[PDB]
């Protein structure tokens, strides 16, 4: 699945359109922060404001594994 795509229509909604944050905190480098697994989980799981499962299955994997890459 387009991780670039489910990120434009699910985490740029609240991160901005350029993942530098907006109504939540930068996840442009969050691969820099946090692997691929723990990005996972948070989608997942939600995170303090973050409601969990935003996306799900390969669209989460995907968009993940992709910010693991985004530094
Ligand atoms: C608004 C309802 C959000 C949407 C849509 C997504 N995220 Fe989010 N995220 C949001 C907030 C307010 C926060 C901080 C949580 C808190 O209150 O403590 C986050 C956090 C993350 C993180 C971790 C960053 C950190 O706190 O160190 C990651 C890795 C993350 N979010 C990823 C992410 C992705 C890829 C999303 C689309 C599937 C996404 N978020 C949507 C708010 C919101």
Do not use: F, R
């Not at 991780?3 to 905190?25: F, R, W, Y």
């Not at 922060?33 to 989608?43: A, F, G, Q, T, V």
């Amino acid at each position: 699945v387009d991780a670039e795509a489910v990120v434009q229509q699910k985490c740029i909604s609240c991160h901005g359109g350029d993942l530098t944050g907006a109504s939540a905190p930068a996840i442009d480098k969050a691969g820099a922060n946090y692997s691929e697994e723990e990005i996972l989980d948070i989608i997942l799981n939600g995170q303090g404001g973050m409601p969990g499962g935003i996306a799900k299955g390969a669209e989460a994997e995907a968009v993940a594994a992709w910010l693991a890459e985004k530094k």
